[PDB]
């Protein structure tokens, strides 16, 4: 028996088998309807199909499209029988309990898996680094979370959500490149702008100094080759787009930066655990992959935090898949095998068992 690990994101579904070091199937989490197409198939036929996201801001809202995503992952993407594998799933922090119950109900009634488990994505990201206590910056594609975790428990009284993630940064980069004369209004243009964001954009240690250097010299400019042979030059946008994470006002959002929200979450926590939260600051998600974001986060929090406090930011190079990696570490443990919500336990207890076993 091999345990399926499936991290469901707003932009990417990352699925694979426990024990693997990387998701066997990482694909966009979109559903196309004119029969339905899921993932890359729907992404290719953007003109013919209408695309919908079953997950928005990390919380599942469209359950039919989510069920289609899960079926595509099990059969069309992993090519394994769901009924033979204990399926480990993931949930967003502060997920409504009705969503967890619906998740287990669909897992056991529609897929008939022999076992399953639901874990918070930030908790898995913290597990993947060998930690049980610490604060996780889970910044993905639809939402950013600051989640303090005390011995595997995500404290609901300090978790905070910021609707500012990789997708908003892609839109902001499109806006800036339009300001510089580059036309990016189409879906393919959005995809190539996302590619530019992934390959060239970075977090500046000091935004004002970086802007001054970009204005004065031209060393920070980088060249990018568009699919249709066109070559563009990107200058200050290599650090203006990521800066929206720390200064959301760039996109008209009145909320605080990721550093300020991290400090707010740590302040909402008991004063006895704040030192451990500062010393274990885990960055996770695709939007935390910008070069220099770890140093910038450390500097900003050191500015906000008390001087005597020691702040360490943990940003593993594989942090883009750290949720799935933590899930694969989880589902392949010997002590975890009794934690699976078995089909028998679900039958004798009902969906609400997910509250009493997965917490």
């Amino acid at each position: 028996t091999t345990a399926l690990v499936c991290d469901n994101g707003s932009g990417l579904v990352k699925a694979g088998f426990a024990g693997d070091d990387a998701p066997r199937a990482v694909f966009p989490s979109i559903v196309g309807r004119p029969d339905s197409y899921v993932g890359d198939e729907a992404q290719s036929k953007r003109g013919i199909l209408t695309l919908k996201y079953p997950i928005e801001h990390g919380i599942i809202t469209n359950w039919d499209d989510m069920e289609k995503i899960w079926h595509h992952t099990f059969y069309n993407e992993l090519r394994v029988a769901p009924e033979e594998h204990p399926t480990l799933l993931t949930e967003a922090p502060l997920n409504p309990k009705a969503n967890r119950e619906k998740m287990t109900q669909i897992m056991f009634e529609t897929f008939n898996v022999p076992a399953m488990y639901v874990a918070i994505q930030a908790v898995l990201s913290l597990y993947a680094s060998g930690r049980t206590t610490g604060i996780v910056l889970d910044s993905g594609d639809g939402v950013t979370h600051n989640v303090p975790i005390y011995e595997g428990y995500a404290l609901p009284h300090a978790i905070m959500r910021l609707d500012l993630a990789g997708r908003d940064l892609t839109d902001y980069l499109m806006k800036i490149l339009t300001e510089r004369g580059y036309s990016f209004v189409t879906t393919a243009e959005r995809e190539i702008v996302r590619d530019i964001k992934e390959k060239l954009c970075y977090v500046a240690l000091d935004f004002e100094n970086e802007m001054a250097t970009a204005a004065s010299s031209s060393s920070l400019e980088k060249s990018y080759e568009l699919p249709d042979g066109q070559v563009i030059t990107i200058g200050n946008e290599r650090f203006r787009c990521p800066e929206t994470l720390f200064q959301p006002s760039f996109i008209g959002m009145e909320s605080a930066g990721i550093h300020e929200t991290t400090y707010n979450s740590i302040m909402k926590c008991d004063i006895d655990i704040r030192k451990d939260l500062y010393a274990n600051n885990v960055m996770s998600g695709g939007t935390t992959m910008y070069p220099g974001i770890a140093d910038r986060m450390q500097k900003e929090i050191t500015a906000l935090a008390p001087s005597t406090m020691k702040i360490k930011i943990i940003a593993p190079p594989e942090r883009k898949y750290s949720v799935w990696i933590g899930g694969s570490i989880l589902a392949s443990l010997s002590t975890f095998q009794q934690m699976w919500i078995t089909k028998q336990e679900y039958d004798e207890a009902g969906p609400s068992i997910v509250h009493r076993k997965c917490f």
């Binding site: 309990k97 595997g152 570490i329 443990l333 002590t335 975890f336 009794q338 934690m339 509250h355």
Partner: protein, 350 residues
Amino acid sequence: YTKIESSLLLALDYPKLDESDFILLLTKFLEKKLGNNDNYPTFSKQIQKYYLEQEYKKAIENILRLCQENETLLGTNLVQRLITKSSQVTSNPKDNESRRFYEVLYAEHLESILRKDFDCSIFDELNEAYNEVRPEYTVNDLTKINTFEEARKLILAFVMLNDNVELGLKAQSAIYQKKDRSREELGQVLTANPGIMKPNSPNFADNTVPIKKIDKIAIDEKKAGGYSKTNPQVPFVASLSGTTYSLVVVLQKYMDKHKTDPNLEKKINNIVMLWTSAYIKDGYASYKEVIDIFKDAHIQSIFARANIKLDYAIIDDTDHEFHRAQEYTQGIATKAMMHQELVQKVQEKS
């Protein structure tokens, strides 16, 4: 060692396993094994009652007796391991996570009982006795009490009398001098756990409450022979509930005004049950602090001289809270063992 035995033995390895945890887990194991016995429900009910009264030594002894009786069906090595573990557990007043979870669910059960067939006359007369006790500088906006919520509001409003009407009771009390709550004002902390559960303790996704601020209260370690140190099985949410002495004063004036009431003992027990439910569910005090206030020598003398026998909110049907606390304890201990294994695995992997 089957799956059930392996799960039990893994859970017992929990370094923070305490008496409450030990009793809950072992009773769940024995209910899975010997639950088909005809005489087992008596044992389960007796252990549940011993657990509610925090008679942990008696419940542990009964569990060990049953294990040694069914040692052939359970297994001599397994039963020996359970016996060895029973003498190795303790309790810390600051963190009794399973006991706090159980006490919160128990207070919820008390409230559920009270809402069923609620009698408003009892608490109308309680409010009238409150008006005849409260000082001139304390107001009371409850002209009359008609539903459960108003009665609970009055019960919680009894805090005004504190530091005034019950100074005599506190002075004559022998255990209140052992109250060891540290008075230093530590402020407030955010929490999403209900009742007396600690902010950082795990909770079920359906058991969390809206985020709210609660006072951060600690133990005065310098006190010699404090209540909490003396009574370690009691979850320290506060020390001995002082406002319950104000409740005792109001109940004195209630009994003196209803000496001819045939059901005075029933009404007093109902009032004490509501007080215990509200003080646990709102995190002001645990079950044992209120009950030890009612179990003091001269407070018990006060209640006896009016011929009132206090049940101390004790009910005989604690099935749901006990089973939910067993599930909670299993989850906590299993997840602690899994955290140990996962930390070891990741440390060895990298």
